[PDB]
Enzyme design. Structure first.
Site, PDB file in Angstrom:
ATOM      1  N   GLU A  37      -4.444   0.751 -10.101  1.00 13.89           N
ATOM      2  CA  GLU A  37      -5.688   0.268 -10.682  1.00 13.89           C
ATOM      3  C   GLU A  37      -6.455   1.356 -11.421  1.00 13.89           C
ATOM      4  O   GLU A  37      -7.610   1.134 -11.798  1.00 13.89           O
ATOM      5  CB  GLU A  37      -6.585  -0.327  -9.594  1.00 13.89           C
ATOM      6  CG  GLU A  37      -6.284  -1.770  -9.240  1.00 13.89           C
ATOM      7  CD  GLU A  37      -4.902  -1.952  -8.660  1.00 13.89           C
ATOM      8  OE1 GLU A  37      -3.992  -2.350  -9.415  1.00 13.89           O
ATOM      9  OE2 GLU A  37      -4.731  -1.688  -7.451  1.00 13.89           O
ATOM     10  N   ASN A  42       2.085  -2.584  -9.509  1.00 12.84           N
ATOM     11  CA  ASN A  42       1.679  -3.362 -10.664  1.00 12.84           C
ATOM     12  C   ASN A  42       1.693  -2.520 -11.942  1.00 12.84           C
ATOM     13  O   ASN A  42       1.381  -1.327 -11.918  1.00 12.84           O
ATOM     14  CB  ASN A  42       0.284  -3.933 -10.440  1.00 12.84           C
ATOM     15  CG  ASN A  42      -0.765  -2.851 -10.260  1.00 12.84           C
ATOM     16  OD1 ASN A  42      -0.633  -1.971  -9.406  1.00 12.84           O
ATOM     17  ND2 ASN A  42      -1.814  -2.907 -11.070  1.00 12.84           N
ATOM     18  N   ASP A  56      -1.254  -8.927 -10.642  1.00 12.25           N
ATOM     19  CA  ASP A  56      -1.304  -7.801  -9.706  1.00 12.25           C
ATOM     20  C   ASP A  56      -0.516  -8.127  -8.433  1.00 12.25           C
ATOM     21  O   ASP A  56      -1.032  -8.104  -7.314  1.00 12.25           O
ATOM     22  CB  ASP A  56      -2.759  -7.412  -9.401  1.00 12.25           C
ATOM     23  CG  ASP A  56      -2.872  -6.218  -8.465  1.00 12.25           C
ATOM     24  OD1 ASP A  56      -2.330  -5.142  -8.791  1.00 12.25           O
ATOM     25  OD2 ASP A  56      -3.516  -6.360  -7.401  1.00 12.25           O
TER      26      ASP A  56
HETATM   27  O1  LIG Z   1      -1.336  -0.238  -7.223  1.00 14.04           O
HETATM   28  C1  LIG Z   1      -1.982   0.539  -6.479  1.00 14.04           C
HETATM   29  O2  LIG Z   1      -2.225   1.709  -6.864  1.00 14.04           O
HETATM   30  C2  LIG Z   1      -2.476   0.086  -5.108  1.00 14.04           C
HETATM   31  C3  LIG Z   1      -2.803   0.779  -3.937  1.00 14.04           C
HETATM   32  C4  LIG Z   1      -3.226   0.086  -2.842  1.00 14.04           C
HETATM   33  C5  LIG Z   1      -3.439   1.253  -1.885  1.00 14.04           C
HETATM   34  O3  LIG Z   1      -3.183   2.431  -2.250  1.00 14.04           O
HETATM   35  O4  LIG Z   1      -3.871   1.027  -0.726  1.00 14.04           O
HETATM   36  C6  LIG Z   1      -3.336  -1.276  -2.881  1.00 14.04           C
HETATM   37  C7  LIG Z   1      -3.016  -1.970  -4.060  1.00 14.04           C
HETATM   38  N1  LIG Z   1      -2.586  -1.270  -5.149  1.00 14.04           N
HETATM   39  C8  LIG Z   1      -3.133  -3.467  -4.094  1.00 14.04           C
HETATM   40  O5  LIG Z   1      -2.867  -4.082  -5.067  1.00 14.04           O
HETATM   41  C9  LIG Z   1      -3.580  -4.176  -2.931  1.00 14.04           C
HETATM   42  O6  LIG Z   1      -3.673  -5.356  -2.963  1.00 14.04           O
HETATM   43  C10 LIG Z   1      -3.928  -3.422  -1.679  1.00 14.04           C
HETATM   44  C11 LIG Z   1      -4.369  -3.831  -0.463  1.00 14.04           C
HETATM   45  C12 LIG Z   1      -4.531  -2.699   0.330  1.00 14.04           C
HETATM   46  C13 LIG Z   1      -5.000  -2.612   1.780  1.00 14.04           C
HETATM   47  O7  LIG Z   1      -5.332  -1.503   2.267  1.00 14.04           O
HETATM   48  O8  LIG Z   1      -5.056  -3.650   2.488  1.00 14.04           O
HETATM   49  N2  LIG Z   1      -4.184  -1.597  -0.413  1.00 14.04           N
HETATM   50  C14 LIG Z   1      -3.814  -2.026  -1.652  1.00 14.04           C
HETATM   51 LA   LIG Z   2      -2.254  -2.792  -7.362  1.00  9.77          LA
END
Ligand SMILES: O=C(O)c1cc(C(=O)O)c2c(n1)C(=O)C(=O)c1cc(C(=O)O)[nH]c1-2
Ligand SMILES: [La+3]
Length: 579
Positions: free
Chosen positions: A171, A255, A297
């Site tokens: 992101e 993503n 995503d």
């Molecule tokens: O693409 C990324 O860089 C990244 C990292 C993370 C993360 O590092 O925890 C999540 C996501 N994307 C993501 O899309 C997501 O839905 C998500 C949920 C969580 C969580 O801690 O429950 N981390 C992340």
């Molecule tokens: La993400």
């Protein structure tokens, strides 16, 4: 490491966040079984002093338990011999500037043990090797720069003499990768990017196969427009698996960069992809993209569970994966052939199916429904009713596999989504998303936002489904006692029968459970422990304090009713049986 395979062979320990190299999350301990787990009682508890979301599980090497916390990722070493006394503590100094550069809570998904060291991957992309017996630093190396929006939430994977680590920032326009470091020194060995030129991918254009055929030259560059792959996402924050008999490590890429698919034309390879690399060189043997040209995503980072089952009457080396896009893939982990690809939530509507006809022209690609495609609806247009939501049918929470029942126990979500993309320009260190989201329970079902189901990966069917009021954000664990443990967002640690699916145990932990359940054995007696502390994306409204219904990227207002069941927390609860 050989020190890791000796720990996996000891069921009284937990040297990996994944239980075993195969990521099955299945313990051979059967002292707590389906006939006495109703008598399960709390043995002792331990608070970490840290708030926000607690993911992962503590490790137990020998008679010492190692507990990690979210940011600033403190590592405790509890002497299980000395009444859970803190023998040494590691409190790392990190820049609080790193918290806003995290997508979804200050979470950290655990540690790893290798050659007498505790491997910690801090949120600021700092890999630290701590001595297991004293906590002294063996070496520290920085894997990325949070100035550019690069953090880490995942755990590490130790293989032989190397450590493979991931990086977050899908992101934040991060060109993500996976990096192998030397175990004894911390020197960088190889760096395999998920996107970019072939030298950065570490891919053999004539020998690396996708869907049975070679990927060819510039397999990823030819699916990106200009230099936008330099900010192209595909991050590696999930779980890593490894098969020693095949000399292959497996993971999933995240993503593709921004959430606006119009400004990112092309398949955006190799985001949303299952990888199979050599641990020593990084060379990909085979590779398979699940969600080409993502519009929702649907981070393809979820775990790759390696099993050896009989498919079509032949014993095959399999690879099962429950992706965010709602499809449970079953692959041949040697060749990369996709055998099964079905929905493990019947409400998934973003695609009709994944075309597996070997001469279909669309072989290996999901048939995107135009009604629920945000690129076809266009920028600044709200695509209503997409199931699953951006958090997918299953997120970071790992699923478990029981070889006795042959079933997969996966903690699923049941949330749909309104999606409106818009054009955004990229600034380093600033978010690079471009979407306003709104989540809500699926119109069907019962109003619940979670399910704990059983999956048959060889025919692609749900054997039984248990409903949950909120999403099931806690990792599951199956044991040889025909029991599966998992934690609910309302703070309940449940145990279900492996075959029937009947709830056998239920206890209220102090906070919502987003970590994985683990088990160990001390002085001959089996214990089962779990970390409580609501957070992640499901509890982002509680963890970040957001009050807007669209803040937290839609998940703040999607879990509004969570506040009347749990607060923030940071506790470890240990369960056992009355002597
Ligand atoms: O693409 C990324 O860089 C990244 C990292 C993370 C993360 O590092 O925890 C999540 C996501 N994307 C993501 O899309 C997501 O839905 C998500 C949920 C969580 C969580 O801690 O429950 N981390 C992340
Ligand atoms: La993400």
């Amino acid at each position: 490491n050989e020190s890791v395979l000796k720990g996996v062979a000891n069921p009284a320990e937990q040297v990996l966040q994944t239980v075993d190299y195969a990521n099955t999350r299945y313990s051979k301990l059967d002292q707590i079984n389906a006939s006495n787990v109703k008598n399960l009682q709390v043995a002792w508890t331990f608070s970490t002093g840290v708030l926000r979301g607690h993911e992962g599980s503590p490790l137990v090497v020998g008679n010492i338990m190692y507990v990690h916390t979210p940011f600033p990722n403190i590592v405790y070493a509890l002497d299980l011999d000395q009444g859970a006394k803190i023998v040494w503590k590691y409190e790392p100094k990190q820049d609080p500037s790193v918290i806003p550069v995290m997508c979804c809570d200050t979470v950290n998904r655990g540690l790893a043990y290798a050659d007498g060291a505790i491997l910690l991957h801090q949120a600021d992309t700092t890999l630290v090797s701590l001595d297991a017996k004293s906590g002294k630093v063996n070496w520290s190396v920085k894997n990325g720069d949070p100035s550019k929006g690069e953090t880490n939430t995942a755990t590490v994977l130790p293989v032989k003499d190397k450590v493979i680590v991931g990086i977050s920032g899908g992101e934040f326009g991060v060109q993500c990768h996976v990096t192998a470091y030397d175990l004894k020194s911390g020197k960088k060995v190889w760096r395999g990017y998920s996107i970019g030129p072939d030298d950065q991918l570490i891919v053999d254009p004539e020998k690396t196969t996708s869907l049975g055929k070679p990927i060819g030259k510039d397999s990823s560059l030819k699916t990106w427009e200009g230099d936008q792959w330099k900010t192209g996402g595909g991050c590696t924050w999930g779980w890593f698996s490894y098969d020693p008999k095949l000399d292959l490590m497996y993971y999933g890429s995240g993503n593709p960069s921004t959430w606006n698919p119009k400004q990112r034309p092309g398949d955006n390879k190799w985001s949303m992809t299952i990888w199979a690399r050599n641990p020593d060189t990084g060379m990909a043997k085979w590779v398979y993209q699940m969600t080409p040209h993502d519009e929702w995503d649907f981070d393809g980072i979820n775990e790759m569970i390696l099993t050896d089952q009989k498919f079509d009457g032949k014993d095959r080396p399999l690879l099962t994966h429950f992706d965010r896009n709602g499809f449970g893939y079953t692959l041949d982990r040697a060749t990369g052939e996709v055998l099964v690809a079905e929905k493990f939530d019947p409400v998934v509507n973003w695609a009709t199916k994944v075309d597996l006809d070997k001469g279909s022209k669309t072989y290996g690609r999901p048939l995107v429904v135009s009604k629920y495609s945000t690129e076809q609806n266009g920028e600044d247009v709200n695509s209503k009713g997409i199931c699953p939501a951006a958090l997918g049918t299953k997120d970071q929470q790992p699923a478990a596999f029981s070889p006795k029942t042959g079933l997969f126990y996966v903690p699923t979500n049941h949330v749909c989504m309104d999606y409106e993309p818009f054009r955004v320009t990229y600034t380093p260190g600033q978010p690079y998303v471009g979407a306003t989201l709104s989540m809500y329970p699926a119109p069907g079902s019962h109003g619940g936002m979670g399910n704990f189901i059983a999956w048959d990966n060889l025919q692609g069917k749900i054997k039984w489904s248990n409903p949950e009021q909120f999403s099931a954000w806690g990792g599951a664990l199956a044991t040889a006692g025909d029991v599966v443990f998992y934690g609910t967002l309302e703070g309940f640690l449940k145990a279900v029968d492996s075959k029937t699916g009947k709830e056998l145990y239920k206890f209220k932990t102090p906070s919502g459970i987003i970590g994985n359940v683990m088990t160990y054995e001390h002085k001959g007696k089996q214990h089962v422990a779990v970390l409580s502390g609501v957070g992640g994306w499901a509890g982002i409204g509680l963890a970040a304090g957001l009050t807007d219904p669209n803040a937290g990227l839609g998940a703040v207002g999607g879990y509004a009713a969570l506040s009347s069941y749990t607060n923030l927390g940071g506790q470890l609860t240990v369960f056992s049986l009355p002597n």
